[PDB]
Design a protein around this ligand. Structure first.
Ligand SMILES: OC[C@H]1O[C@@H](O)[C@H](O)[C@@H](O)[C@@H]1O
Ligand SMILES: OC[C@H]1O[C@@H](O)[C@H](O)[C@@H](O)[C@@H]1O
Ligand SMILES: OC[C@H]1O[C@H](O)[C@H](O)[C@@H](O)[C@@H]1O
Ligand SMILES: NS(=O)(=O)c1cccc(F)c1
Ligand SMILES: [Zn+2]
Length: 257
């Protein structure tokens, strides 16, 4: 099964998911000097005040915080997006050390981790139909650097001991994802893909320029999770990131002059 190890990691994925070598794969390096300000991008609207979180799950690759997406609540609109995209889950990618962990890079810089808030285009009715469409998904990506603690992350940190191994879940109601955002919504955007199998080319990426700061202790607790299930040999859940992929025939646009 796919994973991040030497024998099943990103360099192997193409054998079962040939789109891994496709024309709009993610992540990419964001060259900040070649990214061009796009005056046509509409204002971005992150509207999370009515979000309904439900559960946190260790899926053997990362942990997902899942949201009720049965009606318009937490939604992402504007920017490059045509229509309304509903929040379904967020998760992170992170490293074994603070010097790596992000999927996107900024002028080749790797951050300690990267948060992905995943949304699907409501015109397609359900996530499964959305991932059959070129404009089915929008992922809001946020870099994490290590410094001061992020208060809005601590509830996540503090529940991880209850979902240590693959297949474990816990109730995670009444969590406010607004506490994970930076101050500024300046962003870069480009068309890409899921960064894990099945690597589907359905995503409008919106990557915020301003990182959030998290404490060393917060990210260290991410690294205590396990890729394996209960009773199996312990494999620490670290380095669950895909490296940057070829930009090919794409341009990265900036929301800011
Ligand atoms: O409890 C987390 C969040 O859930 C939302 O549904 C509420 O409207 C917010 O006020 C609250 O902060
Ligand atoms: O032909 C000129 C156009 O080239 C495109 O590649 C750029 O995205 C546009 O910003 C530019 O106006
Ligand atoms: O908001 C997410 C979670 O935070 C804390 O773990 C609370 O104890 C729990 O009740 C809540 O579900
Ligand atoms: N890492 S990611 O591209 O955000 C992603 C991968 C797979 C499924 C999904 F909903 C989101
Ligand atoms: Zn992701």
């Amino acid at each position: 099964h796919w994973g991040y190890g030497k024998h099943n990691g990103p360099e192997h994925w193409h054998k079962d998911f040939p789109i891994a070598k496709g024309e709009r794969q993610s992540p990419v390096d964001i060259d900040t000097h070649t990214a061009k300000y796009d005056p046509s991008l509409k204002p971005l609207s992150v509207s999370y005040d009515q979000a309904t979180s439900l559960r946190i799950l260790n899926n053997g690759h990362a942990f997902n915080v899942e949201f009720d997406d049965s009606q318009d609540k937490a939604v992402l609109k504007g920017g490059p997006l045509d229509g309304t995209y509903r929040l379904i889950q967020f998760h992170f990618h992170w490293g074994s050390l603070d010097g790596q962990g992000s999927e996107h890079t900024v002028d080749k810089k790797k951050y300690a981790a990267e948060l992905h808030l995943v949304h699907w285009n409501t015109k397609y009715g359900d996530f499964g139909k959305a991932v059959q469409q070129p404009d089915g998904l929008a992922v809001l990506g946020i870099f994490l650097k290590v410094g001061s603690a992020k208060p809005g992350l601590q509830k996540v940190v503090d529940v991880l001991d209850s979902i240590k191994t693959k297949g474990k879940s816990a109730d995670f109601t009444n969590f406010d994802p607004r506490g994970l955002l930076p101050e500024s919504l300046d962003y870069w955007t480009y068309p890409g893909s899921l960064t894990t199998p099945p690597l589907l080319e359905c995503v409008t990426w919106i990557v915020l320029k301003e990182p959030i700061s998290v404490s060393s202790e917060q990210v260290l607790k991410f690294r205590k999770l396990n890729f394996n299930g209960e009773g199996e040999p312990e494999e620490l859940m670290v380095d669950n990131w895909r490296p940057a992929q070829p930009l090919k025939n794409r341009q990265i646009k900036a929301s800011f002059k």
